[PDB]
Write a protein that holds these residues in place. Structure first.
Motif, PDB file in Angstrom:
ATOM      1  N   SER A  96     -10.801  10.850 -12.912  1.00 31.75           N
ATOM      2  CA  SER A  96      -9.542  10.924 -13.661  1.00 31.75           C
ATOM      3  C   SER A  96      -9.380  12.362 -14.152  1.00 31.75           C
ATOM      4  CB  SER A  96      -9.505   9.923 -14.824  1.00 31.75           C
ATOM      5  OG  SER A  96     -10.442  10.267 -15.831  1.00 31.75           O
ATOM      6  N   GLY A  97      -8.377  12.591 -14.992  1.00 31.50           N
ATOM      7  CA  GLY A  97      -8.180  13.903 -15.576  1.00 31.50           C
ATOM      8  C   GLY A  97      -7.284  13.783 -16.787  1.00 31.50           C
ATOM      9  N   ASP A  98      -6.937  14.943 -17.360  1.00 32.11           N
ATOM     10  CA  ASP A  98      -5.855  14.987 -18.340  1.00 32.11           C
ATOM     11  C   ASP A  98      -4.546  14.536 -17.712  1.00 32.11           C
ATOM     12  OD1 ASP A  98      -7.847  16.145 -19.786  1.00 32.11           O
ATOM     13  OD2 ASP A  98      -6.794  18.037 -20.140  1.00 32.11           O
ATOM     14  N   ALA A 140       0.862  -1.178   0.000  1.00 34.78           N
ATOM     15  CA  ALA A 140       0.000   0.000   0.000  1.00 34.78           C
ATOM     16  C   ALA A 140       0.900   1.230   0.000  1.00 34.78           C
ATOM     17  CB  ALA A 140      -0.954  -0.005   1.211  1.00 34.78           C
ATOM     18  N   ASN A 141       0.307   2.384  -0.299  1.00 34.09           N
ATOM     19  CA  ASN A 141       1.015   3.646  -0.162  1.00 34.09           C
ATOM     20  C   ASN A 141       0.141   4.627   0.615  1.00 34.09           C
ATOM     21  OD1 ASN A 141      -0.852   4.853  -1.958  1.00 34.09           O
ATOM     22  ND2 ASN A 141       0.472   4.523  -3.737  1.00 34.09           N
ATOM     23  N   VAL A 142       0.715   5.782   0.910  1.00 37.94           N
ATOM     24  CA  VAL A 142      -0.016   6.917   1.452  1.00 37.94           C
ATOM     25  C   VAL A 142       0.308   8.069   0.521  1.00 37.94           C
ATOM     26  CG1 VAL A 142      -0.297   8.528   3.371  1.00 37.94           C
ATOM     27  CG2 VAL A 142       0.003   6.067   3.825  1.00 37.94           C
ATOM     28  N   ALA A 143      -0.723   8.684  -0.051  1.00 35.57           N
ATOM     29  CA  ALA A 143      -0.506   9.527  -1.214  1.00 35.57           C
ATOM     30  C   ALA A 143      -1.603  10.569  -1.335  1.00 35.57           C
ATOM     31  CB  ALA A 143      -0.476   8.696  -2.507  1.00 35.57           C
ATOM     32  N   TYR A 144      -1.197  11.781  -1.716  1.00 36.04           N
ATOM     33  CA  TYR A 144      -2.107  12.755  -2.293  1.00 36.04           C
ATOM     34  C   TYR A 144      -2.371  12.401  -3.746  1.00 36.04           C
ATOM     35  CZ  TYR A 144      -1.839  16.063   1.615  1.00 36.04           C
ATOM     36  OH  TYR A 144      -1.942  16.670   2.844  1.00 36.04           O
ATOM     37  N   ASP A 145      -3.616  12.583  -4.171  1.00 38.96           N
ATOM     38  CA  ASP A 145      -4.022  12.346  -5.550  1.00 38.96           C
ATOM     39  C   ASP A 145      -4.694  13.613  -6.028  1.00 38.96           C
ATOM     40  OD1 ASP A 145      -3.929  10.705  -7.740  1.00 38.96           O
ATOM     41  OD2 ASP A 145      -5.945   9.916  -7.475  1.00 38.96           O
ATOM     42  N   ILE A 146      -4.186  14.183  -7.115  1.00 39.72           N
ATOM     43  CA  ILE A 146      -4.728  15.411  -7.690  1.00 39.72           C
ATOM     44  C   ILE A 146      -4.941  15.180  -9.180  1.00 39.72           C
ATOM     45  CG2 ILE A 146      -4.344  17.853  -8.123  1.00 39.72           C
ATOM     46  CD1 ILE A 146      -2.160  17.105  -5.560  1.00 39.72           C
ATOM     47  N   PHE A 147      -6.147  15.461  -9.664  1.00 42.29           N
ATOM     48  CA  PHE A 147      -6.438  15.435 -11.093  1.00 42.29           C
ATOM     49  C   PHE A 147      -6.617  16.854 -11.612  1.00 42.29           C
ATOM     50  CE2 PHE A 147      -8.590  11.169 -10.150  1.00 42.29           C
ATOM     51  CZ  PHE A 147      -7.517  10.428 -10.574  1.00 42.29           C
ATOM     52  N   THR A 148      -6.144  17.099 -12.831  1.00 42.89           N
ATOM     53  CA  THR A 148      -6.449  18.338 -13.528  1.00 42.89           C
ATOM     54  C   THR A 148      -6.933  17.983 -14.923  1.00 42.89           C
ATOM     55  OG1 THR A 148      -4.271  18.790 -14.548  1.00 42.89           O
ATOM     56  CG2 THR A 148      -4.576  19.431 -12.248  1.00 42.89           C
ATOM     57  N   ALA A 149      -7.704  18.887 -15.517  1.00 45.02           N
ATOM     58  CA  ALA A 149      -8.177  18.676 -16.879  1.00 45.02           C
ATOM     59  C   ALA A 149      -8.435  20.020 -17.541  1.00 45.02           C
ATOM     60  CB  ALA A 149      -9.445  17.824 -16.899  1.00 45.02           C
ATOM     61  N   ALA A 150      -8.262  20.056 -18.867  1.00 44.25           N
ATOM     62  CA  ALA A 150      -8.623  21.253 -19.614  1.00 44.25           C
ATOM     63  C   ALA A 150     -10.116  21.527 -19.516  1.00 44.25           C
ATOM     64  CB  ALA A 150      -8.210  21.115 -21.077  1.00 44.25           C
ATOM     65  N   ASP A 151     -10.932  20.470 -19.429  1.00 46.43           N
ATOM     66  CA  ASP A 151     -12.371  20.581 -19.236  1.00 46.43           C
ATOM     67  C   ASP A 151     -12.649  20.777 -17.754  1.00 46.43           C
ATOM     68  OD1 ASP A 151     -15.111  20.415 -19.046  1.00 46.43           O
ATOM     69  OD2 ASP A 151     -15.276  18.387 -19.868  1.00 46.43           O
ATOM     70  N   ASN A 188      -1.392   6.383 -17.617  1.00 51.13           N
ATOM     71  CA  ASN A 188      -2.499   5.520 -17.230  1.00 51.13           C
ATOM     72  C   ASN A 188      -3.565   5.789 -18.285  1.00 51.13           C
ATOM     73  OD1 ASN A 188      -4.697   4.199 -16.169  1.00 51.13           O
ATOM     74  ND2 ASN A 188      -4.549   5.093 -14.119  1.00 51.13           N
ATOM     75  N   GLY A 189      -3.650   4.910 -19.287  1.00 54.09           N
ATOM     76  CA  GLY A 189      -4.503   5.218 -20.426  1.00 54.09           C
ATOM     77  C   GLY A 189      -3.994   6.467 -21.117  1.00 54.09           C
ATOM     78  N   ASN A 190      -4.887   7.420 -21.357  1.00 51.37           N
ATOM     79  CA  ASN A 190      -4.492   8.693 -21.944  1.00 51.37           C
ATOM     80  C   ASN A 190      -4.185   9.767 -20.901  1.00 51.37           C
ATOM     81  OD1 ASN A 190      -6.577   7.623 -24.418  1.00 51.37           O
ATOM     82  ND2 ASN A 190      -4.582   8.496 -25.007  1.00 51.37           N
ATOM     83  N   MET A 191      -4.175   9.421 -19.616  1.00 56.02           N
ATOM     84  CA  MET A 191      -3.829  10.362 -18.554  1.00 56.02           C
ATOM     85  C   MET A 191      -2.350  10.236 -18.200  1.00 56.02           C
ATOM     86  SD  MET A 191      -5.551  10.687 -14.788  1.00 56.02           S
ATOM     87  CE  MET A 191      -5.184   8.976 -14.383  1.00 56.02           C
ATOM     88  N   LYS A 192      -1.638  11.363 -18.215  1.00 57.61           N
ATOM     89  CA  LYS A 192      -0.231  11.407 -17.832  1.00 57.61           C
ATOM     90  C   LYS A 192      -0.117  11.577 -16.322  1.00 57.61           C
ATOM     91  CE  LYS A 192       4.202  13.421 -19.172  1.00 57.61           C
ATOM     92  NZ  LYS A 192       4.944  14.439 -19.975  1.00 57.61           N
ATOM     93  N   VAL A 193       0.725  10.755 -15.689  1.00 62.43           N
ATOM     94  CA  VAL A 193       0.777  10.638 -14.229  1.00 62.43           C
ATOM     95  C   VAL A 193       2.183  10.969 -13.760  1.00 62.43           C
ATOM     96  CG1 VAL A 193       0.349   9.193 -12.179  1.00 62.43           C
ATOM     97  CG2 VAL A 193      -0.930   8.772 -14.344  1.00 62.43           C
ATOM     98  N   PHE A 194       2.297  11.990 -12.910  1.00 64.01           N
ATOM     99  CA  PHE A 194       3.543  12.338 -12.238  1.00 64.01           C
ATOM    100  C   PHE A 194       3.407  11.945 -10.777  1.00 64.01           C
ATOM    101  CE2 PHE A 194       2.447  15.589 -15.376  1.00 64.01           C
ATOM    102  CZ  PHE A 194       3.558  15.623 -16.195  1.00 64.01           C
TER     103      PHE A 194
END
Ligand SMILES: OC[C@H]1O[C@@H](OC[C@H]2O[C@@H](O)[C@@H](O)[C@@H](O)[C@@H]2O)[C@@H](O)[C@@H](O)[C@@H]1O
Length: 223
Positions: A116-118, A98-109, A155-161
């Protein structure tokens, strides 16, 4: 606890925060369960915990139960002055995957679905077991006064940093704009074209348990 959320996508909302018992990958498990518990909430942040056991599907995330900060849609990343956040957390056991993580999505829309997001920006405060981020590591980067291993992938068409702390950060007060600014000027992240979709802190559970992650405090301040 003051409220108990055991069903998939169980939901609580209060004081501009929310918790989702986000068992999105539970079909990947041969057995298990997970609830999320609200311990307290106020305008200045919330306290919560989650307990889970998951078995099977070694490389698949079963869940990302999270506490999210609420905010209006339509905020451009470059319009945001500050994305400050504080968290104190601890697991009651070492032996989980497991991890402990912040998850942030952004999208042009600006109305992009919240699942998910862009782009995805993860900040891994801890990493248990052999679990790995999306993509491949590209080196160690200095962001917000700390060093992080930066992973990049699709991840699919989403770029993940994913920014990985070198040791567990059980307590952290960060400025998430630092990570977006780093990405804008070092990884060609088009921050001026992106809108904030979600801002979450939680734990990606793969296998193990029964284990409990306690969030003594979670707050975020966006302005
Ligand atoms: O619609 C049900 C819930 O969706 C949830 O988002 C699912 C999404 O979670 C991310 O963590 C990521 O790991 C994806 O693989 C997964 O699809 C959740 O945010 C809720 O907003 C919904 O209730």
């Amino acid at each position: 606890q003051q409220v108990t959320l055991c069903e998939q996508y169980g939901y609580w909302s209060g004081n501009g925060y929310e918790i989702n018992n986000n068992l999105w990958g539970r079909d990947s498990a041969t057995s298990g369960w997970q609830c999320s518990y609200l311990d307290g909430s106020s305008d200045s942040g919330i306290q919560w915990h989650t307990t889970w056991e998951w078995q099977g599907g070694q490389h698949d995330v079963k869940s990302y139960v999270y506490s999210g900060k609420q905010f209006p849609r339509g905020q451009r990343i470059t319009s945001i002055n500050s994305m400050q956040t504080s968290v104190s957390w601890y697991y009651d056991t070492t032996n989980v995957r497991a991890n402990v993580a912040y998850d942030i999505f952004t999208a042009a829309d600006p109305n992009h679905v919240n699942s998910s997001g862009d782009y995805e920006l993860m900040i891994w405060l801890a990493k248990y077991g052999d679990v790995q981020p999306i993509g491949s590591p590209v080196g160690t980067v200095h962001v917000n006064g700390r060093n992080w291993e930066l992973w990049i992938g699709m991840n699919g068409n989403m770029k993940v940093f994913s920014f990985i702390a070198p040791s567990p950060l059980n307590s952290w007060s960060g400025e998430v704009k630092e990570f977006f600014n780093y990405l804008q000027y070092n990884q060609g992240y088009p921050a001026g074209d992106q809108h904030l979709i979600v801002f979450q802190m939680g734990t990606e559970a793969f296998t193990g348990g029964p284990a409990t992650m306690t969030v003594s405090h979670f707050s975020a301040n966006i302005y």
